[PDB]
Amino acid sequence: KIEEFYAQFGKYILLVPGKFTGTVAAHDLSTGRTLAWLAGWNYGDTNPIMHHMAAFPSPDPYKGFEFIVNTQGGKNLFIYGIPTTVKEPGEGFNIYRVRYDGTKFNLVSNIAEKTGLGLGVHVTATPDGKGFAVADGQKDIFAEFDLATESVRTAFLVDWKPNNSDLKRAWLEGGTMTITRLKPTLPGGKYDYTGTKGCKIDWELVPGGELFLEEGKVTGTRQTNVVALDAFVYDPRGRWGALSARLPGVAIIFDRQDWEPVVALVGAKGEPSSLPVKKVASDTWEIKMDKVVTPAHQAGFSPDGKNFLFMNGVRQNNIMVWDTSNHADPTKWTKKAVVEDPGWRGSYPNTFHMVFTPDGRKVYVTLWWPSPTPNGIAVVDARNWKLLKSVDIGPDMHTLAITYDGKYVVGVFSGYQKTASGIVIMDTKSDEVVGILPSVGGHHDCVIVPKTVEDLRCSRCTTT
Amino acid sequence: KIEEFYAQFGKYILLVPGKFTGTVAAHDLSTGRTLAWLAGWNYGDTNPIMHHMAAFPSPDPYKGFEFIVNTQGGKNLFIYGIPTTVKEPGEGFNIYRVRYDGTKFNLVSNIAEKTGLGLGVHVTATPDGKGFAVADGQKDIFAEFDLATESVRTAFLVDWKPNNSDLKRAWLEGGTMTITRLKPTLPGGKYDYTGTKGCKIDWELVPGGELFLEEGKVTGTRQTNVVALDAFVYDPRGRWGALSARLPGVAIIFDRQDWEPVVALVGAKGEPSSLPVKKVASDTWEIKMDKVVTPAHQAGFSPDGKNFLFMNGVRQNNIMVWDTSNHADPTKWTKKAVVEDPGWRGSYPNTFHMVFTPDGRKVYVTLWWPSPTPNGIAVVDARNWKLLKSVDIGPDMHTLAITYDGKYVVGVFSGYQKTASGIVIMDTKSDEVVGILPSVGGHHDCVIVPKTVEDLRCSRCTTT
Ligand SMILES: [Cu+2]
Ligand SMILES: [Cu+2]
Ligand SMILES: [Cu+2]
Ligand SMILES: [Cu+2]
Numbered sequence: 036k037i038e039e040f041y042a043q044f045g046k047y048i049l050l051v052p053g054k055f056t057g058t059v060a061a062h063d064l065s066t067g068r069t070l071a072w073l074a075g076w077n078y079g080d081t082n083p084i085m086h087h088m089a090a091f092p093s094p095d096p097y098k099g100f101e102f103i104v105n106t107q108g109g110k111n112l113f114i115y116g117i118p119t120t121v122k123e124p125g126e127g128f129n130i131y132r133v134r135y136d137g138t139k140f141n142l143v144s145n146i147a148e149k150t151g152l153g154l155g156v157h158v159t160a161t162p163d164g165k166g167f168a169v170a171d172g173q174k175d176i177f178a179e180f181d182l183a184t185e186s187v188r189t190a191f192l193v194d195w196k197p198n199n200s201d202l203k204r205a206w207l208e209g210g211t212m213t214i215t216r217l218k219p220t221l222p223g224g225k226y227d228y229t230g231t232k233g234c235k236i237d238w239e240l241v242p243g244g245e246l247f248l249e250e251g252k253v254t255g256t257r258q259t260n261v262v263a264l265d266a267f268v269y270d271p272r273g274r275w276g277a278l279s280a281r282l283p284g285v286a287i288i289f290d291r292q293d294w295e296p297v298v299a300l301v302g303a304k305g306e307p308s309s310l311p312v313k314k315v316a317s318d319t320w321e322i323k324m325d326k327v328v329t330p331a332h333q334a335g336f337s338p339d340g341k342n343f344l345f346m347n348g349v350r351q352n353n354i355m356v357w358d359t360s361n362h363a364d365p366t367k368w369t370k371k372a373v374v375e376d377p378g379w380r381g382s383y384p385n386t387f388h389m390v391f392t393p394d395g396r397k398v399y400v401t402l403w404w405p406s407p408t409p410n411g412i413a414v415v416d417a418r419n420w421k422l423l424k425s426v427d428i429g430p431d432m433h434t435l436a437i438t439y440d441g442k443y444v445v446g447v448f449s450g451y452q453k454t455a456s457g458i459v460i461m462d463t464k465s466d467e468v469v470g471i472l473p474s475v476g477g478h479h480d481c482v483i484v485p486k487t488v489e490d491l492r493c494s495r496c497t498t499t
Numbered sequence: 500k501i502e503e504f505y506a507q508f509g510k511y512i513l514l515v516p517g518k519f520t521g522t523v524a525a526h527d528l529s530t531g532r533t534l535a536w537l538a539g540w541n542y543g544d545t546n547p548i549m550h551h552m553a554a555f556p557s558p559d560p561y562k563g564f565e566f567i568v569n570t571q572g573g574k575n576l577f578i579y580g581i582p583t584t585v586k587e588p589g590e591g592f593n594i595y596r597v598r599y600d601g602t603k604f605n606l607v608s609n610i611a612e613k614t615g616l617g618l619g620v621h622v623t624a625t626p627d628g629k630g631f632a633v634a635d636g637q638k639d640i641f642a643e644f645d646l647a648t649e650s651v652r653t654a655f656l657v658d659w660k661p662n663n664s665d666l667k668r669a670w671l672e673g674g675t676m677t678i679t680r681l682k683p684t685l686p687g688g689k690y691d692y693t694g695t696k697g698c699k700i701d702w703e704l705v706p707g708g709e710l711f712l713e714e715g716k717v718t719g720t721r722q723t724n725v726v727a728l729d730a731f732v733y734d735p736r737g738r739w740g741a742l743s744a745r746l747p748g749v750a751i752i753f754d755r756q757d758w759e760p761v762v763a764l765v766g767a768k769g770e771p772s773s774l775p776v777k778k779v780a781s782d783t784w785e786i787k788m789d790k791v792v793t794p795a796h797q798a799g800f801s802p803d804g805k806n807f808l809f810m811n812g813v814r815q816n817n818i819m820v821w822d823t824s825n826h827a828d829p830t831k832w833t834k835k836a837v838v839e840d841p842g843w844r845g846s847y848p849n850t851f852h853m854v855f856t857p858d859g860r861k862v863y864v865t866l867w868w869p870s871p872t873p874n875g876i877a878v879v880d881a882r883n884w885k886l887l888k889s890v891d892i893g894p895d896m897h898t899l900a901i902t903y904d905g906k907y908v909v910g911v912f913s914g915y916q917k918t919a920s921g922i923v924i925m926d927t928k929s930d931e932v933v934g935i936l937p938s939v940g941g942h943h944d945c946v947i948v949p950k951t952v953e954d955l956r957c958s959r960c961t962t963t
């Protein structure tokens with residue numbers, strides 16, 4: 036009897052982007068009703084690949100809330116096996132502000148249009164809930180934005196110059212990563228990165244697909260210069276952000292106060308904790324890497340700020356953990372644990388998206404595989420850094436959120452945009468699935484609308 | 500754990516079109532997983548208002564099944580209060596054959612492109628599961644199609660010549676309804692009715708729309724000639740179909756054996772059971788009406804074929820019942836009962852989608868209202884023809900299906916394409932809602948995949 040079922044979850048609203056569905060929706064977990072949804076194409080967005088999102092604190096989400104959801108475009112339509120005859124896909128890379136008003140969603144604005152930065156990968160809210168970052172893995176640009184004035188606080192380009200320009204070897208044998216503070220180049224303080232402009236490669240490196248670039252499977256004009264920026268995740272204590280770069284397996288720490296990169300964490304087990312960042316011009320820094328052992332993808336801080344996690348993938352499948360307890364000095368942050376399992380020894384599964392419990396005692400980590408292996412959730416003890424349980428969910432598992440009273444993990448799986456998809460709920464006490472709800476969605480994201488800034492510590496702010 | 504909850508629904512697959520979401524999806528009600536979905540826009544359908552659908556018998560739906568789903572287009576995008584700036588929307592009126600193969604959907608063909616008939620209103624499967632009809636109330640055309648060969652069996656235009664050419668009086672004061680058997684006009688045996696071609700009005704009439712048409716609130720080139728065809732529903736005993744025409748409030752019975760109209764049933768309480776059809780040329784019939792007392796919309800046979808129902812709307816809100824137990828002679832079909840309620844005295848609710856229990860003992864009927872009145876489900880005794888109970892569900896209630904063991908009615912509500920939406924499940928023993936599943940959809944339809952031709956008797960075949 037279902038009232039009893041939902042009544043246990045509490046008054047929390049799940050938001051999900053639909054990827055190839057083109058939708059965003061909000062669902063009330065306390066009743067199982069969908070409160071509202073919006074279809075990008077209704078508005079003239081002809082390629083609404085609704086990708087990542089974050090929501091800002093609201094005193095009463097059921098009366099109103101805001102979020103940012105972005106899109107990808109161009110040939111991103113062509114990489115998930117849908118046999119479409121579309122010849123010229125919409126450019127995409129939109130960044131939309133959407134407000135729920137208690138009845139419906141309202142499309143407030145297109146921040147990519149206003150600012151000129153079209154960025155299609157992770158969206159993250161800043162810890163005070165008053166700005167957000169968006170990163171892009173085809174352009175290798177990220178920016179932090181002020182929500183009130185819809186403007187750019189900072190924007191950076193990250194470039195790779197490979198030691199070996201052979202595409203198979205362009206990362207393995209190392210390189211120089213250059214970080215450049217960008218300045219607007221169009222009148223009105225606008226950037227020139229609308230739609231597909233700035234792309235080094237012609238579609239994103241897909242879930243699990245970091246190496247397709249080196250293997251010669253991705254077209255583009257600047258293939259060996261890619262780093263595949265993914266996310267800028269936030270230290271919940273403030274001041275610092277971590278920019279994940281998937282191909283070199285590096286999280287670059289930035290000082291948000293002066294907007295400079297300070298240190299570069301190196302993912303791979305058996306490599307150093309970090310490499311220095313050297314300033315080479317007023318607006319340009321470099322990191323030198325002799326080699327890249329493995330790519331890395333998902334990244335995040337623990338709620339208290341004292342641990343940072345980076346998921347090595349493909350060449351190694353592990354969770355790398357740094358002690359980040361020294362808030363004053365990121366060059367003191369040192370690897371302190373690595374979560375490994377014999378069953379992660381192949382190419383897959385990849386340790387993937389994460390969410391921590393509010394008390395910081397456990398981290399849930401998705402386990403991604405290509406079809407047809409069931410994808411699932413790893414439950415990790417975040418005090419001793421040991422894997423506790425793996426639970427199978429279904430195909431193409433993506434993000435996890437958690438109810439902010441810490442009782443229930445809520446995840447989405449997304450069927451590779453063509454098979455089974457769902458919203459899964461896991462009880463954090465028993466670490467068992469309490470159920471599956473249907474979901475028309477290929478979501479690579481999901482969030483529970485936060486009420487407070489403290490909620491963001493366990494939302495799309497600290498972690499992907 | 501919802502496990503227990505879904506186990507009781509049994510192994511049934513629910514299909515739903517998205518309306519303004521642009522998707523179709525199948526949900527396994529035994530597990531809560533969405534088996535597969537498809538997004539019209541991915542395929543270059545720029546205005547995929549996914550509208551009506553029917554599914555065919557499959558001996559194991561979990562291993563595979565097929566269905567037809569159609570779309571609307573043109574200005575139908577502009578009538579649900581979505582503040583879109585789109586100036587020239589996609590033409591639409593597609594008719595897609597979709598096959599689930601056990602893992603995903605395959606968009607098999609575009610039967611509208613293949614045949615040239617673009618029809619955007621109800622889709623209904625024939626009782627043998629080998630064909631399907633599609634009607635359209637902007638064009639006033641319907642056709643029955645052979646599924647195997649994806650070809651037209653028959654197609655008809657219905658036209659209104661009003662007694663009074665004043666648009667406000669064009670139906671009230673009666674007229675002559677002309678039925679024409681159509682012939683292809685293009686090479687290849689194609690029709691010339693793709694996209695918006697053949698439209699007499701520029702959108703489908705909304706609930707209560709007949710007054711908005713009379714009042715001059717709907718644009719179009721042939722406003723006084725519209726009958727607003729809705730559906731061709733099937734006698735489960737075979738041989739006959741009923742074509743509903745909303746504005747005259749008539750269901751025209753056709754002999755599927757020779758493809759000729761045989762009698763016209765008249766909806767309104769206090770009018771004759773029916774009027775004669777006269778053949779006036781090889782391919783043309785007429786029905787004469789001295790007056791039209793009220794419009795009517797939803798229409799359907801009981802599972803045994805012995806009752807036909809037609810929902811008077813707007814000027815009367817009732818369920819008109821005919822004794823249709825004479826299978827040999829529709830001209831003998833006579834009004835036997837009318838379901839009325841003091842609460843039906845206003846403009847709304849409109850009685851408008853239905854589903855019968857397998858044993859024929861009850862019929863569930865949706866109660867539609869404009870926002871913000873809660874919409875709901877009426878439960879009618881289909882032996883004594885009395886209203887038993889009304890239950891409130893949500894905003895914008897649409898269709899009802901029933902699991903084929905007769906245990907659960909499954910309905911969808913759709914938030915006027917902007918607010919709350921969901922799938923509701925009602926236990927047919929207590930006639931109480933057992934609960935609500937989230938649903939990103941503005942669905943005007945839903946069906947449960949049939950196993951047998953007997954299942955179609957309670958599916959999108961005998962009723963809308
Ligand atoms: Cu990512
Ligand atoms: Cu993901
Ligand atoms: Cu993604
Ligand atoms: Cu209808």
Ligand SMILES: [Cu+2]
Nearest residue numbers: 852897898943
């Ligand atoms: Cu409906």
Ligand SMILES: [Cu+2]
Nearest residue numbers: 518550942943
């Ligand atoms: Cu509709």
